[PDB]
Design a protein around this ligand. Structure first.
Ligand code: R9Q
Length: 161
């Protein structure tokens, strides 16, 4: 029933993610991120190409810190599934994630590189897409960070490319 109800709510949540009111978009992004933490509702989000497109679009245009963390966090969760990596890939997720590599918000930064690593690992076409978006230069720029786990994931992205 969790999956069926998340499924019905999706079109309205997709609509509110594209709203002009920034408080409406933030609240919808908080909602969708919460839905992405439960496997039944994460399944429903991955099956909606329109919903994944709205999370990508919102993530790359938002100036709201919580909105950026919630939307990148949502993509991070969906990237742990094959039917999730594919939806991110088709919705223009790679260029948006590459832009997020320039975030001063460290959780957005960690979510962005982990999702991109999951993509470079199992998504066909992700290698060339990361390169076309300038991800090679962006990832090299991060090698100056000091967190051990973050540096290793970033170095494996470059070792994969
Ligand atoms: C949310 N956001 C947009 C922008 C920003 C605006 C206002 C406050 C902060 C903080 N802290 C950051 O900075 C970014 C730059 C590049 C990629 C992504 C971000 C990003 O994460």
């Amino acid at each position: 029933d969790d999956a069926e109800l998340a499924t019905r709510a999706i079109p309205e949540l997709t609509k509110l993610l594209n709203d002009e009111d920034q408080v409406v978009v933030n609240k919808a992004a908080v909602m969708v991120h919460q839905l992405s933490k439960k496997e039944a509702s994460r399944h429903a989000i991955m099956r909606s190409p329109q919903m994944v497109s709205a999370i990508v679009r919102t993530m790359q245009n938002t100036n709201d810190v919580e909105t950026a963390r919630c939307t990148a966090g949502t993509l991070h969760n969906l990237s742990h599934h094959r039917e999730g990596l594919l939806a991110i890939f088709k919705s223009g997720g790679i260029p948006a994630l590459v832009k997020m590599l320039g975030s001063p918000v460290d959780s957005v930064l960690f979510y962005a590189i982990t999702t991109l690593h999951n993509l470079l690992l199992h998504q066909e076409g992700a290698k060339m897409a990361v390169r076309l978006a300038g991800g090679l230069q962006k990832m090299v720029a991060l090698l100056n960070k000091t967190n051990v786990k973050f540096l290793a994931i970033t170095t494996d992205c470059l070792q994969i490319l």
